[PDB]
Amino acid sequence: IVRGVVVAIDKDVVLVDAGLKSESAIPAEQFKNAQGELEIQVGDEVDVALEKAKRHEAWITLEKAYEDAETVTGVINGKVKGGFTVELNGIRAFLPGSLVDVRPVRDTLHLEGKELEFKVIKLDQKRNNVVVSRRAVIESENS
Amino acid sequence: EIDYKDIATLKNYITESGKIVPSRITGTRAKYQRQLARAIKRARYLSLLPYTDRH
Amino acid sequence: SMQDPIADMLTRIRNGQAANKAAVTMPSSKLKVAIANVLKEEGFIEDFKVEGDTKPELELTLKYFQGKAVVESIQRVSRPGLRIYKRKDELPKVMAGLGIAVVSTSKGVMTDRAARQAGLGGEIICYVA
Amino acid sequence: KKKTTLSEEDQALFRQLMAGTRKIKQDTIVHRPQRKKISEVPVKRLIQEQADASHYFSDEFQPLLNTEGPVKYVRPDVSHFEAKKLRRGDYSPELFLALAGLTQLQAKQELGALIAACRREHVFCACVMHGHGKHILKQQTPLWLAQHPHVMAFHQAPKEYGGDAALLVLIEVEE
Amino acid sequence: ELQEKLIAVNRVSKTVKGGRIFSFTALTVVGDGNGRVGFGYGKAREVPAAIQKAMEKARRNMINVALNNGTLQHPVKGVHTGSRVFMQPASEGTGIIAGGAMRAVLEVAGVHNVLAKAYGSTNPINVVRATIDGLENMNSPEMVAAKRGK
Amino acid sequence: MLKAGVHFGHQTRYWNPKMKPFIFGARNKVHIINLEKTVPMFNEALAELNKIASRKGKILFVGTKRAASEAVKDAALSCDQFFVNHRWLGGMLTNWKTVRQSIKRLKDLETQSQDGTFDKLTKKEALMRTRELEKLENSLGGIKDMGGLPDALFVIDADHEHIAIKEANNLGIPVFAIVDTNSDPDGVDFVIPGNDDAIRAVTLYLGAVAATVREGRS
RNA sequence: GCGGCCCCCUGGACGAAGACUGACGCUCAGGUGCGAAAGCGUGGGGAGCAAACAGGAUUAGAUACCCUGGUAGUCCACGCCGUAAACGAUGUCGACUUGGAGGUUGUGCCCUUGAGGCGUGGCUUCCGGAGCUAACGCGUUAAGUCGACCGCCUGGGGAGUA
């Protein structure tokens, strides 16, 4: 996280001072509200944590979607003890092995390396995480 | 990697048709790609893994 | 293998002058300190310093007059493949006297001026131009 | 003597502020360029000035000079009274240039050198001797001089400085 | 007091679309007669334009030489491209006795009585370039004594 | 005079070994210039640069990268001095001859522009001519009132403006450069190890230089 | 030159700390050894491929390219041959001389707070500085700066032939 001040604002480009060898440049996409305007001015002390970085402060635009069960896309990449970490829009998800691993009938190797579409019901902005549902198994397994 | 009897691990490092995956894909530093491949081949001799998917 | 440590010394000084090196270290010996004392005496190096106890290390602080380097061309004359022993009459002057030639005479390691004045020739080690 | 500077302790404090261990200590041989001479004026610079000044002397371009009377010229924007002062001899030349016997090409170079010298040395008035000729230096040189931006005015020199065989030239100098 | 002289004029060619096109190259050396030697190449479509560009380039790009009384100081070897060149001061070793294209640069250089012998290639464009390099890295007894203290 | 406040060095990438005497060089892969070496260097540059500025000389600030503009226009124009802020034309010092007649065309076209016949005879060609004044005005901007080739040169980046340094070395003009750790002290007579691409650093930096150019005994 | 996997016999290299010998080193004419492929000898083997060969085409012709077959050979054991654009067209050994990005294989230190950070070796790839070079390029693995020893060159052809 970096705390900087806005000094130069030329349409489509915002210049923030941090104190390194160069001053960062932030695209207006991070400072734009839901109405279609800006929310800052020259002389304002804003926050900026570094387009593979603007997502950290762009997920705030996906709240109005998770309020009505917004279907998204992700892929498993991490695995521990009964816990699965999925990269959903760049947010680690939680999937217990309650149904993932139980009563093995055959070669259950279709887990590590699967790329389907999952559904979300509840989101946690307090733990910067998004736990996946359970009943949505009827869509991810065989869509 | 060092071991060949753990065919869960070996089965991750192999494609759907029995072929060894390149380290260009899976990361796997070259020492462990060599141990890996040699372990895959020892496992294919024991019929723990398949040589192909048309046996 | 190392078979001519003197030419190795002069190589260290040519490549130190050529790389604007401030100082040059090498393994040390009696003959290298004799030559180095002649070079300091004649003004081609700034100083030398032999350190170490069991493995001595000669260190030559080099000279640079302007941006240019002082030691313009140092050559090894009496190499091991073919040794060159001149008399007091055959004893050469380098750059028509503007540049000494370090000759090992029986009285010690001298220059060409000093050994032609001493009246005795010897084994001509190196041209410093 | 060492120049006034922040205290060594202050420098250490700056080092302390430096995040991390934050110290660089690479040691390498250092070479320092020799200080430029106060006099300066290298021959190459002089040659360059000469070339720059002579660049204005075109053989194809002929400024309209007064055909009636002694040769004279005043640059647009300069007081016409300056040419009159030259004629009366109010100006005493500090530099003298003799062109007689030179080829046109040599003369142009020398003229350029003269103008460069006047500027460098803050000489405002110079005398140019071209001799007498038909379709020669006597005629071509005034035309070349007019084309030069630093030439303010010139007039046929008084008898004391060569008369009809010479020109007094006023040169614009930064003071 | 300029003392200019031309060494070599040649006809080079280009070979365009319709036939060939022939150009002329001069190679001159100027010098005052007391150090101060320059050479210039210059090339143009006719011969007098070529020599004039050569003189005009040679009047600038002029180098100092530390002469002796009327001659060189110590024997010096200058090399350029394929052209290796020896010179020997010849302390009043009368007359400039140098090869072609070296006699000229040594003549306008102001030296009078050296001994030369060019080796290797003896292309005139590279045998000067191997005389100036040569006369440039020849230093005087007040320069060597300046360097090494005394 | 004031201690360099906020730049502390930069350029992790393409660093140059000839900048090895000037580097403290620790943090996070990036190189830190030893500013305890910069302060005597920069005070020397102010010393000789004030020395030629007091002899009534011309200085020519060089500011092609952004945002050295309009900071070089502000700093050069705060003095009675000259600048290049857009693309430095290859050869405005070493053939200033030809650049003299381009400056002459800029003067004749602005005199023709705001006073004389600008609305005369055409609209399209008049628009053509005005945008010739934009092109000749932003390229030959500061240098248009010089009338000589200058007595010093002050460049703001040594590798980005290597052409101007190469020409001022070709002509015997003292080059005053703020080098960074990627740059090379070519023929820069008065090197200053600093930071080339921080606007705080170049406004502080040109502030000091423009301060000492017009410094007056009064 | 060596490419599945396993066993047996075996050579070298490199790294870490310490101990030991104490110049035992470097190069090398003659000499000796190893030396792709094709080839040769004796005895096996022979699936594929394939000089030769045969047929079909193509073509003016086609003793070729293309097609269909196809023997020696390629494979094994032992012996011979002794050569290649056997090539980094770059002899071996040692020393010194600015840099950058990698690869590969060791090792030490630090919160290992991970797929890290800092070093220190061995081998190797690409680009480049000075320098060198006819140029092209080489460029700490030199074609730079030196030393030791060896091999070889001296216009093209005839001729690497008699």
Report CA-CA distances (Å) from C86 to C7, C77, C127, C129: 19, 11, 14, 19
User: Does F102 contact D at CB distance below 8 Å?
Assistant: no
Helices D43-54, D104-121: inter-axial angle, 10-degree rounding:
120
Phi, psi for E129 (deg, rounded to 5)? 80, -25
Q: Do chains C and B touch (3 or more CB pairs under 8 A)?
A: no
3-class SS string, chain D: CCCCCCCHHHHHHHHHHCCCCCCCCCCCCCCCCCCCCCCCCCHHHHHHHHHHHHCCCCCCCCCCCCCCCCCEEECCCCCCHHHHHHHHCCCCCCEEEECCCCCHHHHHHHHHHHHHHHHHHCCCEEEEECCCCCCCHHHHHHHHHHCCCCEEEEEECCHHHCHHHEEEEEECCCC
User: Does F23 contact D at CB distance below 8 Å?
Assistant: yes
d(CA E102, CA F111): 57
* Cβ burial, residue C81 (10 Å; 0-12/13-18/19+): exposed
d(CA F152, CA F157): 16
For residue C115, the cross-strand partners are: none
Phi, psi for C13 (deg, rounded to 5)? -70, -40
Phi, psi for A71 (deg, rounded to 5)? -75, 125
Name the closest residue on chain D to residue F47, using Cα atoms. Answer: D3
Residue type, E79: V
Say which residues have a Cβ less than 8 Å from residue C54's Cβ, sequence separation at least 6: none
Contact F19, F115 (CB under 8 A): no
Contact E113, E92 (CB under 8 A): yes
d(CA D33, CA A9): 43
Residue C127's Cβ-side half-sphere holds a number of Cα atoms within 13 Å equal to: 14
d(CA C109, CA D104): 66
For residue E138, the cross-strand partners are: none
Contact C80, C3 (CB under 8 A): yes
Chains C–D, number of C-beta pairs less than 8 Å apart: 9
Q: What is the signed CA dihedral for C100, C104, C109, C113, rounded to 10 degrees?
A: -40
Residue B24: CB less than 7 A from any atom in strand G: no
d(CA D5, CA F39): 7
Name the closest residue on chain D to residue F190, using Cα atoms. Answer: D33
* Count of H-run helices and E-run strands, chain E: 5, 10
Residue type, A57: E
Report CA-CA distances (Å) from A76 to A83, A109, A118, E92, E134: 11, 13, 11, 94, 75
Report CA-CA distances (Å) from F67 to A43, F64, F77, F201, F203: 19, 8, 16, 11, 10
d(CA F118, CA F127): 9
d(CA D5, CA F3): 8
Number of C-beta neighbours around residue C44 at 10 A: 26
User: Does F171 contact D at CB distance below 8 Å?
Assistant: yes
| Structure tokens given for D86 | 């030259």
Number of C-beta neighbours around residue E35 at 10 A: 16
User: Does D122 contact F at CB distance below 8 Å?
Assistant: no
For residue C51, the cross-strand partners are: C57
DSSP, res C71: -
User: Does A115 contact B at CB distance below 8 Å?
Assistant: no
d(CA E141, CA C99): 10
Of the candidates D19, A20, D10, A16, the residue with the CA atom closest to the CA atom of residue F6: A20
Contact F198 A19 (CB under 8 A): no
Q: Which residue is listed with tokens 């060894």? A: B20
Contact E44, E24 (CB under 8 A): yes
Residue F29: CB less than 7 A from any atom in strand G: yes
Number of C-beta neighbours around residue D168 at 10 A: 26
Q: Helix, strand, or coil here: C100? A: coil
Give residue numbers, 149 to 168 of F, with CB < 7 Å from strand G.
Answer: none
d(CA C72, CA C69): 7
Q: Helix, strand, or coil here: E108? A: helix
Residue B25: CB less than 7 A from any atom in strand G: no
Q: Which residue is listed with tokens 């991490």? A: A78
Q: Give me the count of residues in chain C.
A: 129
For strand D72-74 and strand D151-156, is the pairing parallel, antiparallel, or unpaired? antiparallel
CA of D29: nearest nucleotide by C1' is G98
Contact D28 F20 (CB under 8 A): yes
Give the CA diameter of chain D.
Answer: 85
DSSP, res C32: H
Q: Domains, chain C, ranges and CATH? A: 5-69 (3.30.1370.30), 74-128 (3.30.1490.10)
Of the candidates E95, E97, E60, E83, the residue with the CA atom closest to the CA atom of residue E134: E83
Helices F35-53, F199-213: inter-axial angle, 10-degree rounding:
40
Instruction: Give the DSSP H or E segment for E42.
Output: none
User: Does A109 contact B at CB distance below 8 Å?
Assistant: yes
Number of C-beta neighbours around residue E29 at 10 A: 28
* Cβ burial, residue F146 (10 Å; 0-12/13-18/19+): middle
Report CA-CA distances (Å) from A42 to A5, A14, A16, A45: 8, 10, 10, 9
User: Does D7 contact C at CB distance below 8 Å?
Assistant: no
Phi, psi for D17 (deg, rounded to 5)? -65, -40
* Cβ burial, residue A131 (10 Å; 0-12/13-18/19+): middle
* Cβ burial, residue E69 (10 Å; 0-12/13-18/19+): exposed
Q: Which residue is listed with tokens 């070793």? A: E93
Q: Which of the other chains make 3 or more beta carbon contacts under 8 angstroms with chain D?
A: C, F
Residue D21: CB less than 7 A from any atom in strand G: no
Residue type, F55: R
Say which residues have a Cβ less than 8 Å from residue A52's Cβ, sequence separation at least 6: none
For strand D125-129 and strand D95-98, is the pairing parallel, antiparallel, or unpaired? parallel
Of the candidates E123, E135, E31, the residue with the CA atom closest to the CA atom of residue E77: E135
d(CA E59, CA E32): 10
Contact F172 D42 (CB under 8 A): yes
Q: Which residues of B touch A112 (CB under 8 A)?
A: 12
Of the candidates A57, A101, A53, A110, the residue with the CA atom closest to the CA atom of residue A80: A101
User: Which string of DSSP letters, residue by residue, matches chain F?
Assistant: -PPP-S------SS--GGGGGGB---GGG---B-HHHHHHHHHHHHHHHHHHHTTT----EE--STTSTTHHHHHHHHTT--EE-S---TTSSTTHHHHHHHHHHHHHHHHHHHTSSSSSS-SHHHHHHHHHHHHHHHHSSGGGGT-S--S-EEES-TTTTHHHHHHHHHHT--EEEEE-TTS--SS-SEEEE--SS-HHHHHHHHHHHHHHHS----
- For chain G, which bases have at least one atom within 7 A of a protein Cβ? 4-6, 25-26, 93-100, 103-106, 115, 118, 129-131, 133-135, 144-149
Residue B27: CB less than 7 A from any atom in strand G: yes
d(CA A100, CA A107): 13
* CA angle (F45 as vertex; F41, F46 as ends), nearest 5: 120
* Cβ burial, residue F203 (10 Å; 0-12/13-18/19+): middle
Name the closest residue on chain A to residue B10, using Cα atoms. Answer: A109
Of the candidates F209, F140, F151, the residue with the CA atom closest to the CA atom of residue F178: F209
* Cβ burial, residue F2 (10 Å; 0-12/13-18/19+): exposed
Instruction: Give the DSSP H or E segment for E59.
Output: helix E47-59
d(CA A139, CA A119): 8
Give residue numbers, 24 to 63 of C, with CB < 7 Å from strand G.
Answer: none
Phi, psi for D107 (deg, rounded to 5)? -65, -45
Of the candidates E58, D44, E62, the residue with the CA atom closest to the CA atom of residue F167: D44
Chains A–B, number of C-beta pairs less than 8 Å apart: 3
d(CA D3, CA F43): 8
Contact D91, D127 (CB under 8 A): no
* Cβ burial, residue C101 (10 Å; 0-12/13-18/19+): buried
Report CA torsion sign: A80, A82, A87, A91: negative
d(CA A129, CA A106): 32
Q: Which residues of A touch B11 (CB under 8 A)?
A: 109
CA of C5: nearest nucleotide by C1' is G147
DSSP, res E109: T
DSSP, res E115: B
| Structure tokens given for B7 | 């065919």
In whole angstroms, G100 C1' to E9 CA is: 47
Please name the method used to determine this structure.
cryo-EM
Q: Strand order of the sheet with strand D72-74?
A: D72-74, D151-156, D166-171, D125-129, D95-98
3-class SS string, chain A: CEEEEEEEEECCEEEEECCCCCCEEECCCCCECCCCCECCCCCCEEEECCCCCCCCCCHHHCHHHHCCCCCCCCCEEEECCCEEEEEECCEEEEEECCCCCCCCCCCCCCCCCCCCCCCCCCCECCCCEEECCCCCHHHHCCC
Instruction: Give the DSSP H or E segment for B55.
Output: none
d(CA D59, CA A28): 62
d(CA A86, CA B12): 18
d(CA E44, CA E49): 6
* Cβ burial, residue A18 (10 Å; 0-12/13-18/19+): middle
The runs of H, that is alpha helices, within chain C are 5-17, 30-42, 112-118
- Closest partner residue to D20 among F23, F27, F36, by Cβ? F27
Contact D72, D155 (CB under 8 A): yes
d(CA E109, CA E3): 9
Of the candidates C77, C129, C63, C101, the residue with the CA atom closest to the CA atom of residue E138: C129
Q: What is the signed CA dihedral for F190, F193, F199, F202, rounded to 10 degrees?
A: -20
d(CA E113, CA D4): 59
Phi, psi for C60 (deg, rounded to 5)? -105, 110
Contact D34 C66 (CB under 8 A): yes
